[PDB]
Amino acid sequence: TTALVCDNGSGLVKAGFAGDDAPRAVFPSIVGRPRHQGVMVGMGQKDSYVGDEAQSKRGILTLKYPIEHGIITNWDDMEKIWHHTFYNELRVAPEEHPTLLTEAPLNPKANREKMTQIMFETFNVPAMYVAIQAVLSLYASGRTTGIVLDSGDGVTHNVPIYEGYALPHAIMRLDLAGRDLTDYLMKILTERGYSFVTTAEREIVRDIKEKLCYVALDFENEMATAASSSSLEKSYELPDGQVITIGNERFRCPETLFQPSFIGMESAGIHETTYNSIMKCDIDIRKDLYANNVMSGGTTMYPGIADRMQKEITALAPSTMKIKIIAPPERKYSVWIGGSILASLSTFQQMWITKQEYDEAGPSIVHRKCF
């Protein structure tokens, strides 16, 4: 019996079977509900739209994200997300397939309680397990030691592991990722004359952020270059046919990852978070940590981020260390791909939470069994 890997991220649900490069269902985690007066009768009008169907008809819908910063708020919407990704995207019964689920660290435990109760009572499985995303990222990296910076759409977390031993006191969580960058890009696109206020326009701002933005190596030199000459300005076409051109906003938007005070937040950037997570570890393993930095998630897909992060850590680390950052082209789905590693492992078959253990222990064995 093949297992299931379902990364339920804040932005994109990535679901599929065991042992694939791409997740079989990659779609944004949105539930659409109509906000206008339906005047035509019949023609297959639906009260809700999930996935790319909501993306297609987004002009006449209000889109809701059931997951915000790794914590699921609306649960009936999350049940609709799971029912759509089981019965329609993958078209398989949940009663005959074990399902590995991912989780951000330092998540509230009631979220684990409710996903265990819903997964064992609404979409009742033979077994399910709740795992950490950074461990799967280190699996997909193909190594054992190293520090992982995961950055999805709600959660950016740093986890250091040495020889298979994670350090739970050194795990750091930062609620700053691509949704906050999309909101900041909405805030700074208003400067050039372009207004985007609705939830349907969030997809357009996210598409602009995905296509045109990049990470600058030196911030102030790129400010001087953008202010002096318009060589950095690039164009984009909206679906209504309008043409926009952006300059410095190509590299002001991801800079909030390296400078969180742009959106008004006290905590430090991702390179200071990486460095402080390194120095919280014991002193002997740090040389192994500096040469094995791992980035995963879609937020580190800008084509300037590895050289900038190397420059910042080499500024922070002492000069006798080789700062090597692993930045594969496959790192957008590597959180899923290491889930293909762990679910296919022969040593993982005894660690699943079965139906019977849930039946004596209630929905509380998931704390003592998982991380």
Binding site: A18, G19, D20, D21, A22, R24, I337, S340, I341, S344, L345, S346
Partner: peptide, 23 residues
């Protein structure tokens, strides 16, 4: 030890890597 001395003198990885190419 004496009966032991008497009785003597007498893959996950390639399986997943094949199927990642299917997408």
């Amino acid at each position: 030890r004496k009966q032991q001395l008497a009785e003597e003198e007498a893959c996950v990885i390639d399986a997943l890597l094949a199927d990642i190419r299917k997408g």
